[PDB]
Amino acid sequence: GFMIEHWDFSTPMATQETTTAEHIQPNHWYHCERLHPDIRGWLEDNHVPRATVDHLLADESRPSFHPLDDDNFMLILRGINMNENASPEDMLSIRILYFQGALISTRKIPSRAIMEIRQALAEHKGPKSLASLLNQIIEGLNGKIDLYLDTIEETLNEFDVNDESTYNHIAAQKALISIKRFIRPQQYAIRDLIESESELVTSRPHQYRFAHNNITRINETIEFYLGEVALFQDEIKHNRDE
């Protein structure tokens, strides 16, 4: 079935619920397979408008925040692809709907950050509410981007002009532009979410601001790394003349 997980956040101790749930209920989280044949009917049966279902399930996407009817919204985010035999910069997309007090998330390429949240819920130490769950999805994705950026930084710190074996600047640059494509929009999506004054944000104002600070830092770090690559390229030009 399309429903990977279902949790009830009616109390601070989330309880696991049937993956055969027919109706969307307030305070519940549904984590779903985006490409499964049955998800469209389930969403539409539950009165999610056709056009918003279409955007949520579309092949193409960018990180973005979309205010919808009365407290509802869509939030789309990207994460690093940590799956085996995958290109990490071929970033996964998580598409989230906050609809009638429920959080519905959709995935295709599995997210390590989301697996950690799921594992925490199973061990009875997960988020205490939907507001906190969304916060942890945002920060978990940030965290995994930071880890990937550390591997780029290692490659960059290896750049030695007198050593041609360390000339990996083209690969790093390719990785960095691929990430920048989505991580820049990610920053604006989190900004827009906050400015929306969603009950999920206004209950955790300082925490969402910290999340926004981290995504901003990530973007500034990418810019710096791109500058380092450019500098190394000129250092190679300068070494070829001496």
Binding positions for Cl ion, rule: CB under 5 A = 61, 76, 78-79, 92-93, 107-114, 144, 187, 191
C-beta closer to a second copy: residue 199 or 220 = 220
C-beta closer to a second copy: residue 5 or 153 = 153
Report the DSSP beta bridge partners of residue 96: 75, 105
**Contact indicator for 160, 210 with CB cutoff of 8 Å:** no
Coil vs helix vs strand at 233: helix
129 binds a second copy (CB under 8 A): no
CA distance 57 to 179: 22
Instruction: List the single partner that 47 binds among Cl ion, a second copy, none, CB under 5 to 8 Å by kind.
Output: none
**Contact indicator for 17, 28 with CB cutoff of 8 Å:** yes
Single out the segment in contact with a second copy by CB under 8 A; choices: 5-13, 18-26, 121-129, 208-216: 208-216
The residue type at 169: H
**Contact indicator for 229, 169 with CB cutoff of 8 Å:** yes
The Cβ-side half-sphere exposure at 146, using a 13 Å CA radius, reads 13
Out of 17, 71, 116, 146, name the contact with a second copy by CB under 8 A: 146
Closest separation between CB of residue 164 and a second copy, Å? 7
Residues between 65 and 124 with contacts to a second copy, criterion CB under 8 A: 66, 68-69
Instruction: List the single partner that 111 binds among a second copy, Cl ion, none, CB under 5 to 8 Å by kind.
Output: Cl ion
